């Protein structure tokens, strides 16, 4: 599914991401924009041999199992393909663990490089939330 901007904001807000670990909703929308372009089916191989999956580009070395990543820990206890669903529940649940792991949203280097420090509230402009 390719989410609309406000559609995604509404769903992340429903699943309790707004202000989760102090990160406002616009931070999460911005991260999704630059990680996946709001496309739940997005998959991208990383240089380390792991792959990133779904709306928030969760990796197969630490977080989900894709069966082809040596060293896999699967700390979200989920197959990576489950992070490609139209329903974002699994991605959100996993992202909550990630952002709690010590470095906040710096875990998403696209957030760090494209969102952090910016006017992230723009990403929820016009949305009835």
The experimental method is: X-ray
Among candidate residues 18, 35, 87, 119, the one labeled active-site is 35
Q: Strand, helix or coil at 32? A: helix
Burial of 108 (0-12, 13-18, 19+ CB in 10 A): buried
* Radius of gyration for the chain, computed over Cα atoms and rounded to the nearest angstrom: 14
| Distance between start and end Cα atoms, the chain | 20
Q: Which residues of 9-27 are buried (b: 16+ CB within 10 A; e: fewer)?
A: bbbbbebebbebeebbbbb
Whole-angstrom distance, CA of residue 74 vs CA of residue 89? 17
Residues making up the binding site for substrate? 101
- Listed resolution, Å: 1.3
Number of domains, the chain: 1
Whole-angstrom distance, CA of residue 117 vs CA of residue 94? 24
Is 18 assigned a catalytic role? Answer: no
C-alpha dihedral sign at 103, 2, 77, 13: positive
Q: At a CB cut-off of 8 Å and minimum separation 6, what does 87 contact?
A: none
Element spanning 6, H or E: helix 5-14
- Rounding to the nearest 10 degrees, give the CA dihedral for residues 30, 32, 38, 41: 170
- Residue range of the domain that includes 21: 1-129
Instruction: Please tell me the total number of residues recorded for the chain in this structure.
Output: 129
Whole-angstrom distance, CA of residue 100 vs CA of residue 121? 22
Among candidate residues 7, 52, 87, 119, the one labeled active-site is 52
**Residue 13 is part of a domain; what is its CATH number?**
1.10.530.10
| Token couple for 109 | 């280097």
Is 48 assigned a catalytic role? Answer: no
């Amino acid at each position: 599914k390719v989410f609309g901007r406000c559609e995604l904001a509404a769903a992340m807000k429903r699943h309790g991401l707004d202000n989760y670990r102090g990160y406002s909703l616009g931070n999460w929308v911005c991260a999704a924009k630059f990680e996946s372009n709001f496309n739940t089916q997005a998959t991208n191989r990383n240089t380390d041999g792991s792959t990133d999956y779904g709306i928030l580009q969760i990796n197969s070395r630490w977080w989900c199992n894709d069966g082809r990543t040596p060293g896999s820990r699967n700390l979200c206890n989920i197959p990576c393909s489950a992070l490609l669903s139209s329903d974002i529940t699994a991605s959100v649940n996993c992202a909550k663990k990630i952002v709690s792991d010590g470095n906040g949203m710096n875990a998403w280097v696209a957030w760090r490089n494209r969102c952090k420090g910016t006017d992230v509230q723009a990403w929820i402009r016009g949305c009835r939330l």
